Paper text:
Meromycolate extension acyl carrier protein (AcpM) serves as the carrier of fatty acyl chain shuttling among the individual FAS-II components during the progression of fatty acid elongation. In this study, MSMEG_5634 in Mycobacterium smegmatis was identified as a novel acyl-AcpM-binding protein. MSMEG_5634 and its homologous proteins are highly conserved among mycobacteria and belong to the SRPBCC (START/RHOs_alpha_C/PITPs/Bet v1/CoxG/CalC) superfamily, containing a START domain that functions as a lipid-binding domain involved in eukaryotic signal transduction as well as a cyclase/aromatase domain for the biosynthesis of polyketide antibiotics in Actinomycetes. MSMEG_5634 can transport acyl-AcpM away from FAS-II by forming the MSMEG_5634/acyl-AcpM complex and contributes to intrinsic sensitivity to FAS-II inhibitors.
The structure of MSMEG_5634 was solved at 1.9 Å resolution. MSMEG_5634 has a helix-grip structure that contains seven-stranded antiparallel β-sheets (named β1 to β7) and four α-helices (α1 to α4). α1 and α2 are two short consecutive helices located between β1 and β2, and α3 is also a short α-helix which is followed by the long C-terminal helix α4. The seven-stranded antiparallel β-sheets and the long C-terminal α-helix α4 together fold into a barrel, with a deep hydrophobic pocket wrapped in the middle of the barrel. The first two short helices α1 and α2 fold into a V-shaped structure that seals the bottom of the pocket. A clear linear electron density was observed inserted into the pocket of MSMEG_5634, which might be a chain of a fatty acid based on its shape, indicating that MSMEG_5634 may bind fatty acid chain-containing substrate. In the refined structure of the MSMEG_5634 protein expressed and purified from E. coli, there was a linear electron density, which might be a chain of fatty acid inserted into the pocket of MSMEG_5634. The overall structure of MSMEG_5634 is similar to that of the TcmN polyketide cyclase/aromatase domain but with differences in the conformation of proposed active site residues. According to the protein sequence and structure, the corresponding residues of MSMEG_5634 are Tyr-27, Arg-63, -65, and -84, but the side chains of Arg-63, -65, and -84 all point to the outside of the pocket. Third, the ligand-binding pocket of MSMEG_5634 is more hydrophobic than the pocket of TcmN ARO/CYC. The interaction between MSMEG_5634 and acyl-AcpM was disrupted by the substitution mutation of W30A in helix α2, which formed a helix–loop–helix motif together with the α1 helix at the bottom of the pocket.
Residue numbers in the entry: 0 to 143
Amino acid sequence: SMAKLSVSVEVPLPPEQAWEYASDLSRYHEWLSIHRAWRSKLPETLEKGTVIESIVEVKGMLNRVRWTLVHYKPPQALTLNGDGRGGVKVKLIGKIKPTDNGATVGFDLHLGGPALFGPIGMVVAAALKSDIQESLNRFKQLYA
């Protein structure tokens, strides 16, 4: 078990559209502020077990992360495990749910591994809360 942060946005989009945009990895660089590089070729189709590598920046720190799709259920849920260099271990639970006026796109992000159990974890957690929320706001601005 690990501590976690939670972020969400409501978009004026039906869930199937919100899913299409949220899983369009080729456009993450237009709204995900922490993304810095892809380090493996992006697949045409995602599936449970898909593995992708990227480099992210959080509060000025770079980290190369291997992402594994451990749950994949369009158009409503995905879970991604991340193993970063230096002892970073994260789990990203994504959920897309229909609402009255569109759909919510929210994430629970568990932050762990030795690196984030240590004193830097609350720095990283606070920075990620802001960065991911701002990114979701950009997602909404770009796609809706």
